[PDB]
């Protein structure tokens, strides 16, 4: 059936001409059995021979039938290429385009989960939290079954690296709960500023970390504990001695006490001022500003560009 689909692929390279109004259905059906290419090849090992074959099909659809073709083939690329190294992070850069128009429906949302993990590998957390949230929020209606729960699982990972996360125990489903059970106490350890609470989570749940695949950020989150830990105590305490805060900051010597807060201002954490003698950290705050300009001026282009798209939709849907 894959060879018959290859005869469908050669005919996908020829006729046309002209408006092969049946090739969109060929994009649909073939994307299915291109995922059956994935499953059948995954019965033994990776499909890498079909990675050059997919690149042959993905590039030969350029630029003509890429519409709805390139989106599904790019997910076929991204999925298993996310499983097998490498370079896809910089490959999708030059691949885009975008590629418009987004089709079909949830296809672009799941693509923003796939490339969401990609753009999360660059660790920029504003684009990563917006691509992970837009991946899950844009996907109706399910069932089935658990991979729509998986995008929600890995979604708040970048929110754990942000330094502030809510407790998600109220969002647990009858399935997603039993799947993330270790990840529960993980994000609970991210909320708390305790080091041993987070390290014990790593040692105990490291097996589930192998099941999810996300590891490297678990050891560096200790720096999120020192920055959220100092954000906690500084804003918390009136004037805290560097010896008393040294328990939760685990070192906080008389020297590095300057950099903890100073290099936190470099990251935009706390404004606390410290005169170092013994010393003591005296945290004050005076700010009255902002909450104004970018939100309202962007809302102008937001609403207008939106209603313009809703025009491009409604105005063009009146053919009947």
């Amino acid at each position: 059936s894959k060879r018959y689909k290859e005869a469908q692929k050669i005919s996908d390279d020829l006729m046309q001409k002209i408006s092969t109004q049946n090739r969109r259905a060929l994009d649909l059906v073939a994307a299915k059995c291109y995922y059956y290419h994935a499953r059948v090849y995954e019965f033994l090992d990776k499909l890498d021979v079909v990675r050059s074959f997919l690149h042959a099909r993905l590039r030969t659809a350029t630029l003509r039938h890429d519409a709805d073709g390139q989106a599904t083939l790019l997910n076929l690329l991204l999925r298993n290429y996310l499983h097998y190294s490498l370079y896809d992070q910089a490959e999708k850069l030059v691949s885009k385009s975008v590629f418009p128009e987004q089709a079909n429906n949830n296809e672009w949302a799941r693509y923003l989960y796939y490339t969401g993990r990609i753009k999360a590998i660059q660790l920029e957390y504003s684009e990563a939290r917006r691509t992970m949230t837009n991946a899950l929020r844009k996907a109706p209606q399910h069932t089935a079954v658990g991979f729509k729960q998986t995008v929600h699982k890995l979604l708040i990972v970048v929110e754990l690296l942000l330094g502030e996360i809510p407790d998600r125990l109220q969002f647990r489903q009858p399935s997603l709960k039993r799947s993330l059970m270790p990840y529960f106490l993980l994000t609970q350890a991210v909320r708390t500023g305790n080091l041993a609470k987070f390290n014990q989570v790593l040692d105990q749940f490291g097996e589930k970390f192998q099941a999810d695949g996300t590891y490297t950020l678990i050891i560096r989150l200790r720096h999120n504990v020192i920055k959220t830990g100092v954000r906690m105590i500084s804003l918390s305490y009136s004037r805290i001695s560097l010896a008393d805060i040294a328990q939760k900051l685990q070192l906080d010597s008389p020297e590095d006490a300057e950099f903890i807060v100073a290099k936190a201002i470099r990251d935009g954490v706390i404004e606390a001022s410290i005169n170092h003698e013994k010393g003591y950290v005296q945290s004050k705050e005076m700010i009255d500003i902002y909450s104004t300009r970018e939100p309202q001026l962007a809302f102008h282009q937001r609403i207008s560009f939106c209603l313009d798209i809703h025009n491009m939709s409604v105005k063009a849907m009146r053919f009947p």
Partner: peptide
């Protein structure tokens, strides 16, 4: 859908706050 992606796979506190008095 079922198409595409998904088919693939300080306490409260009671005791401690009352103890803070008689501690010191």
């Amino acid at each position: 859908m079922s198409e595409k992606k998904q088919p693939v796979d300080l306490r409260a506190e009671l005791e401690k706050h009352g103890y803070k008095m008689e501690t010191s």
